[PDB]
Design a protein around this ligand. Structure first.
Ligand SMILES: CCCCCCCCCCCCCCCCCC(=O)OC[C@H](COP(=O)(O)OC[C@H](O)CO)OC(=O)CCCCCCCCCCCCCCC
Ligand SMILES: CC(C)=CCC/C(C)=C/CC/C(C)=C/CC/C(C)=C/CC/C(C)=C/CC/C(C)=C/CC/C(C)=C/CC1=C(C)C(=O)c2ccccc2C1=O
Ligand SMILES: *SC1=C(S)[C@@H]2Nc3c(nc(N)[nH]c3=O)N[C@@H]2O[C@@H]1COP(=O)(O)OP(=O)(O)OC[C@H]1O[C@@H](n2cnc3c(=O)[nH]c(N)nc32)[C@H](O)[C@@H]1O
Ligand SMILES: Nc1nc2c(c(=O)[nH]1)N[C@H]1C(S)=C(S)[C@@H](COP(=O)(O)OP(=O)(O)OC[C@H]3O[C@@H](n4cnc5c(=O)[nH]c(N)nc54)[C@H](O)[C@@H]3O)O[C@H]1N2
Ligand SMILES: CCCCCCCCCCC(=O)O
Ligand code: SF4
Ligand code: SF4
Ligand code: SF4
Ligand code: SF4
Ligand code: FES
Ligand SMILES: [Mo+4]
Ligand SMILES: [S]
Lengths: 57, 975
């Protein structure tokens, strides 16, 4: 297990992976900040609009 | 008084000087990282910024002036505290989840959580310095050092070792030992103050390192990348702080934190012992500890590896033929019981003598004396106190009537003058010396050290005078004569609470100042000036350890010291009195519970009808009218055939008694011998049956330290193997002797002894819970007596009596025994070292005994360092290495007791003891000087603490930090 953890950290320690995890957490936080109660009518309207768009043959 | 307003609400002021104390008492959540209650304002973390009089200032050092306005929720003060903590975290990596100190007590973690911070404006920057793992006990991590200075303030002001400074002038400030010497090579006493007082994991014991939690045992090569990952992943400190709190809860299950009292010396410092199963991870002192608080030495805070040592006797040993067979508990118990019954019903109980250990709890010594009297019917009981505290206690009886110290170590600090004579308090009772040195360096108290050697305290004393061997009585009585003759003595106290002043003056007729100058080999000016100081000093605290009491006239000079304070008038005054340095952790407790043969538990003489009747009623067995023989005279009685059997527990008296050739001959002469030691000690080698003792960590009891404090212990570990706590062993032995004792836990023993002992009338286990401690005497209501002789003396008239004594001639051999070797103990090592040697770190600091020899005598005799030399006395012949130092002067040389082989000093000492108490004169030794090997390895390594050069400075010297251009005060930074 020590070797497994060592491999995991040595591969992950690249700035790209740390940035990826940080931005995933930030995306979760922002999606939490975004209010979705008002977004349900927007989703319904988007559904109707996509239906109308694909209706055009 | 001194009305104040804090948080917009009116509040009152107390004796506290700084705003921080008031805020803490008001439960205001003000960040205080660099402040420790014992350390005092260090002012180096600037996180305690509050608005006093509207201006931003450090609450840790802001004086609580009348009428000031205090605000702590203002955006300004919050921003200042945030900036200060950001500067702190710039020096702290803050990997709380994988950090050993995150046991939830870490001030950076707690304070960071309290401020609800989420970002650090200045990112963490690793210092160029690497971790200093040179020390075998605690490491320093400059990368994690926040420069709060608590460790430096501890090493400079509250422990006064002065090995720690801070190089503020350096580009990256850091803690440096001596002149930036690596830690091991420096003058670090290894006391542990820096480790205990460190807020962060910067200065933390190697025991915790990689062993505290679950995720902290990960290898650094694979832990550091994880730390960098988490640094680059989490955006706010709150969530990962909560995860670290969960990891603290993680640690809470595996980490057992139980209070105990150190076994080594009589200061009786109490601390939690943070363990993980069986190994000892940390010794954490607590501010609530009565005897020490945060104070600790190397022994009590890094010397506990003996508990887990493989040498520990896990099973009873029986002498089978020419070997020690590992026998069962029951068969060994039956053997010892049958043998004791045989020698009890054949030659009578009077031929039975048992010794309790002064290192064991009060219950242990009480069980020894009960087994001797309430079971066997003999009175032959003693302890190390016969060698240690018998003359001091005898002098206290002769003048004051109560044994033990007059007060607590806090009263020692409160003294204006400390009169230490024959005491190596720096190396024997380290924490008390830290208190004295703290009061000397900070409070301005001046101390007078009077001993032949020049230890750490002697070179740090106001007036250090070295008298002749055992000549303390002469100059002391001359000083008393001068004080009582020139009117400086407290005549009012003499008429109020003292008796026989004129008789004592008549006894002082032959004593003159020039007489003492001639006898002690000390110039008149020093004696007259120290007498003037004693007369002028308002409060006097007199400490006399074995350097004076372990003499042929040791009891006489003990009475002389006590009546010297009596003439001065320091008894009953807060902060002053006589504090005989009780050596073992429970030598005071053992003496309290009838260890000495002439007294019963409760410090009552055996030859008293009322106490004998009471003990008969409680025990059901008649008490021996004949007083028991003293420990030293036991060997002579054996050589006369009077004594045949010994039951000595936890005392290696075959190596620590005077003339150990004599005790070896007695041991080979006696028939039956049973010993009770955790380790196969030297005494344990000569025994018909060896009983496996249990160390104080693995047993629960009460330890009575030097300050007459009875502090209750806790069972840190289940006993190793199936060995039992010594009280359990004594209960089993007595039950096999038809005693009928039923003690499930030592609380019953404690309360029974409390009922029996008038002095211990009030001590009970529910009154000793946690860190609560009671100082004997205690009455039935439970109110102890922190200061002795406060209102009246114990004598029937209520007034003490001066004891007329003279100079008893020391039994110097004379003639060819020219060089007068002195015997004592080192700071790191404990006696022969049956416990410290088992700890690897202390062994590295001091591997072997050495003979400290004076530079002047190094010329006439032509002796060098690292040389094997021979010392021959009519009682022994030792081969000890040599050390060159200025601590000793002239012919007189220092031979510490830190070896148990052929190099033990106890060969040289003879069977000449005190008249009053038969205490061997260990300090009265003479030998030869034979040169065997010219060139050899120096016994003292470079990594020893004596080789370093401490830097004496008062405080962290923050003013150097404030002078740095890069430093900016957060209060005016926010502006
Ligand atoms: C090896 C690699 C390991 C890497 C770390 C993994 C874990 C990261 C922490 C957990 C996620 C944190 C991010 C998140 O989640 O959010 C981000 C956002 C930032 O802070 P912001 O500055 O944006 O706001 C501050 C707030 O207002 C006040 O804290 O929030 C927080 O971190 C708040 C965290 C709250 C606790 C953790 C989440 C609990 C979820 C419910 C659990 C219920 C259990 C029952
Ligand atoms: C389909 C299939 C079957 C596939 C199989 C193969 C496959 C793809 C497998 C998945 C592999 C993956 C993605 C594994 C990742 C998930 C796992 C199993 C993880 C376990 C490994 C470990 C040990 C992870 C670390 C967990 C953990 C809680 C670590 C501690 C975090 C650290 C080091 C924090 C240090 C730390 C820092 C750095 C702060 O800044 C800070 C600031 C304020 C307060 C506290 C802190 C603090 O503690
Ligand atoms: S008692 C005793 C025990 S129990 C325990 N032993 C101990 C301790 N610490 C450590 N680290 N290891 C141990 O083994 N502390 C406890 O010490 C108790 C006795 O300690 P002392 O303070 O009496 O210790 P030493 O014997 O080392 O130092 C005594 C000093 O006395 C001076 N001295 C010697 N002969 C003298 C004389 O004739 N006159 C005077 N005025 N002084 C004399 C020397 O300077 C010794 O240093
Ligand atoms: N030359 C010379 N000789 C001296 C002295 C001196 O100054 N000079 N000082 C004298 C004095 S004051 C004393 S204290 C003696 C020191 O002698 P003792 O008081 O006998 O002390 P130590 O050998 O340090 O400890 C005795 C044993 O106790 C055991 N032990 C430790 N903890 C426990 C425990 O909890 N329970 C039990 N049952 N055993 C335990 C240890 O294994 C150790 O072997 O030396 C005396 N001899
Ligand atoms: C003469 C230009 C004709 C443009 C027709 C555009 C598409 C109309 C139908 C849209 C649909 O329903 O797909
Ligand atoms: S020292 Fe304190 S704040 Fe720093 S990582 Fe360790 S527990 Fe966390
Ligand atoms: S003496 Fe050693 S352990 Fe004690 S504070 Fe100084 S450096 Fe730390
Ligand atoms: S090592 Fe000393 S100065 Fe540095 S953070 Fe720890 S206690 Fe403070
Ligand atoms: S000073 Fe004595 S009692 Fe206190 S920790 Fe050190 S050895 Fe233990
Ligand atoms: S407690 Fe005052 S600056 Fe740290
Ligand atoms: Mo002792
Ligand atoms: S002792």
């Amino acid at each position: 297990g020590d070797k497994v953890l060592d491999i995991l950290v040595k591969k992950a320690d690249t700035e790209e992976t740390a940035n990826t995890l940080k931005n995933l957490l930030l995306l979760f936080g922002t999606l939490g900040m975004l209010d979705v109660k008002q977004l349900e009518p927007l989703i319904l309207k988007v559904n109707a609009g996509v239906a109308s768009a694909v209706e055009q043959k | 008084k001194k009305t104040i307003t804090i948080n917009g609400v009116e509040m009152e002021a107390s004796e506290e000087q700084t705003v921080l104390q008031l805020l803490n008492n008001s439960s205001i959540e003000v960040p205080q990282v660099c402040y420790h209650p014992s350390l005092g304002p260090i002012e180096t973390c600037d996180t305690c910024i509050v608005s006093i009089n509207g201006e931003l200032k450090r609450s840790c050092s802001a004086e609580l002036k009348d009428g000031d306005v205090i605000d702590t929720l203002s955006p300004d003060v919050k921003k200042a505290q945030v900036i200060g903590m950001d500067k702190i975290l710039y020096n702290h990596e803050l990997y709380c989840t994988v950090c050993d100190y995150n046991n939830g007590g870490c001030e950076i973690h707690n304070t960071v959580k309290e401020m609800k911070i989420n970002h650090q404006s200045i990112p963490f920057d690793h210092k160029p310095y690497h971790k200093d793992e040179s020390h075998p006990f605690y490491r320093y991590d400059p990368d994690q050092c926040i420069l709060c200075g608590r460790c430096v303030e501890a090493c400079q002001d509250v422990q006064v070792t002065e090995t720690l400074t801070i190089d503020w002038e350096r580009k990256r400030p850091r803690v440096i030992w001596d002149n930036d010497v690596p830690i091991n090579e420096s003058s670090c006493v290894s006391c542990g103050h820096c480790s205990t007082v460190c807020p962060c994991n910067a200065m933390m014991e190697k025991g915790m390192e990689g062993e505290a939690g679950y995720l902290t045992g990960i290898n650094n090569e694979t832990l550091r990348p994880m730390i960098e990952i988490t640094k680059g992943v989490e955006t706010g400190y709150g969530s990962i702080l909560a995860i670290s709190d969960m990891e603290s809860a993680m640690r809470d299950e595996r980490i057992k934190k139980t209070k105990t009292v150190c076994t080594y010396c009589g200061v009786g410092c109490s601390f939690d012992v943070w363990t993980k199963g069986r190994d000892i991870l940390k010794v954490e002192p607590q501010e609530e500890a009565p005897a020490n608080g945060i104070s600790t030495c190397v022994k009590g805070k890094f010397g506990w590896d003996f508990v887990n040592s493989e040498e520990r006797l896990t099973k009873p040993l029986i002498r089978e033929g020419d070997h020690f067979r590992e026998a069962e508990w029951e068969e060994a118990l039956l053997l010892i019981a049958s043998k004791f019954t045989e020698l009890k019903e054949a030659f009578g109980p009077d031929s039975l003598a048992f010794i309790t250990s002064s290192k064991c709890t009060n219950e242990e010594s009480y069980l020894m004396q009960k087994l001797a009297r309430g079971v066997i019917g003999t009175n032959n009981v003693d302890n190390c106190s016969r060698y240690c505290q018998s003359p001091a206690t005898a002098g206290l009886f002769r003048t004051v009537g109560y044994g033990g110290d007059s007060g607590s170590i806090t009263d020692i600090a409160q003294a204006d003058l400390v009169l230490i004579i024959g005491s190596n308090t720096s190396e024997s009772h380290p924490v008390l010396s830290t208190r004295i040195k703290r009061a000397h360096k900070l409070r301005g108290q001046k101390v007078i050290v009077a001993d032949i050697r020049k230890h750490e305290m002697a070179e740090r004393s106001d007036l250090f005078v070295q008298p002749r061997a055992g000549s303390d009585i002469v100059w002391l009585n001359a000083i008393a004569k001068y004080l009582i003759e020139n009117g400086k003595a407290d005549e009012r106290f003499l008429r109020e609470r003292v008796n026989g002043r004129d008789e004592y003056v008549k006894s002082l007729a032959p004593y003159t100042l020039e007489y003492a100058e001639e006898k002690t080999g000390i110039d008149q000016e020093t004696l007259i000036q120290m007498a003037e100081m004693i007369g002028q000093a308002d409060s006097v605290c007199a400490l006399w350890a074995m350097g004076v009491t372990q003499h042929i006239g040791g009891s006489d000079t003990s009475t002389a010291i006590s009546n010297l304070l009596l003439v001065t008038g320091n008894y009953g005054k807060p902060g002053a009195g006589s504090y005989p340095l009780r050596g073992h952790n429970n030598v005071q407790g053992a003496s309290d519970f009838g260890s000495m043969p002439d007294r019963l538990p409760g410090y009552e003489k055996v030859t008293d009808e009322q106490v004998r009747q009471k003990y008969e009623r409680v025990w059901g067995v008649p008490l021996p009218k004949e007083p028991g023989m003293t420990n030293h005279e036991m060997i002579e009685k054996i050589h006369s055939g009077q004594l045949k059997a010994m039951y000595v527990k936890g005392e290696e008296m075959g190596l620590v008694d005077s003339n150990i050739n004599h005790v070896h001959a007695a041991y080979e002469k006696l028939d039956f011998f049973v010993v009770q030691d955790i380790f196969l000690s030297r005494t344990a080698e000569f025994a018909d049956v060896v009983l496996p003792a249990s160390p104080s960590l693995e047993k629960e009891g009460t330890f009575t330290n030097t300050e007459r404090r009875i502090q209750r212990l806790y069972q840190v570990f289940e006993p190793l193997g199936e060995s039992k706590p010594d009280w359990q062993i004594i209960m089993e032995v007595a039950n096999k002797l038809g005693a009928g004792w039923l003690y499930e836990h030592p609380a019953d023993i404690m309360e029974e002894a409390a009922k029996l002992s008038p002095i211990y009338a009030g001590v009970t286990y529910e009154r000793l819970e946690g860190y609560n401690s009671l100082q004997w005497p205690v009455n039935a209501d439970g109110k102890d007596s922190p200061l002795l002789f406060t209102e009246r003396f114990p004598f029937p008239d209520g007034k003490a009596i001066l004891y007329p004594v003279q100079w008893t001639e020391p039994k110097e051999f004379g003639e060819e025994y020219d060089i007068h070797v002195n015997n004592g103990r080192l700071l790191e090592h404990f006696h022969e070292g049956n416990l410290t040697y088992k700890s690897k770190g202390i062994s590295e600091k001091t591997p072997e005994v050495f003979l400290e020899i004076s530079p002047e005598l190094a010329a006439e005799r032509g002796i060098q360092d690292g040389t094997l030399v021979r010392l021959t006395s009519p009682f022994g012949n030792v081969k000890v290495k040599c050390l060159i130092t200025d601590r000793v002067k002239g012919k007189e040389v220092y031979l510490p007791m830190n070896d148990s082989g052929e190099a033990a000093i106890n060969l040289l000492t003879g069977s000449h003891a005190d008249k009053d108490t038969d205490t061997p004169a260990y300090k009265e030794t003479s030998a030869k000087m034979e040169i065997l090997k010219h060139d050899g390895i120096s016994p003292l390594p470079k990594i020893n603490h004596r080789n370093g050069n401490p830097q004496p400075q008062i405080g962290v010297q923050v003013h150097k930090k404030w002078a740095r251009k890069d430093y900016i005060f957060p209060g005016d930074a926010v502006k």
